[PDB]
Curated annotation (Swiss-Prot):
The chain holds residues 1 to 105 of 4017 of the full protein. This is Non-structural protein 1. It comes from Porcine transmissible gastroenteritis coronavirus (strain Purdue) (TGEV). Residues 7-110 form the CoV Nsp1 globular domain. It comes from the Viruses. Signal peptide: none annotated.
C-alpha cells in the first residue's frame, strides 16, 4: 500500500525578476551532477528566474543546459535548455550575482 511522506527539501533562494543576467550553461552530464550537489548543499551563488521573466536570461551556449524547476506543489529539478517550452516550467535556477527577493521552494530531483 502507498503511503504519503515528506521526500523533498525546502530551500530559500534569491528570486530575480528585475535584472538582465548572462549565465553559464553546462553539458547535460555536468548539470545532472550539479543538481545533486545543489540538492545536498543549497543554492548559494544562484538565483531563480521565473518563467514569465525568461527574456532576462542570456547565455553564450544555448545548446547547453541550466537547472530547470518543473511542476506545481513539489517541483522537480531537471536539466533544461533556456528555450524549454513545457507549460509545466516554473523557471530556471542560474548562476548570477544580482539583487532579488527571498522565496521558499519545495524541491526534489527529477
Amino acid at each position: 500500500h502507498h503511503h504519503h511522506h515528506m521526500s523533498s527539501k525546502q530551500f530559500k533562494i534569491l528570486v530575480n525578476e528585475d535584472y538582465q543576467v548572462n549565465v553559464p550553461s553546462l553539458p547535460i552530464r555536468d548539470v545532472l551532477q550539479e543538481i545533486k550537489y545543489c540538492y545536498r548543499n543549497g543554492f548559494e551563488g544562484y538565483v531563480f528566474v521565473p518563467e514569465y521573466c525568461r527574456d532576462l536570461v542570456d547565455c553564450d551556449r544555448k545548446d547547453h543546459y541550466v537547472i530547470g524547476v518543473l511542476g506545481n506543489g513539489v517541483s522537480d529539478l531537471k536539466p533544461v535548455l533556456l528555450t524549454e517550452p513545457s507549460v509545466m516550467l516554473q523557471g530556471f535556477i542560474v548562476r548570477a550575482n544580482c539583487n532579488g527577493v527571498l522565496e521558499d521552494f519545495d524541491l526534489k530531483i527529477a
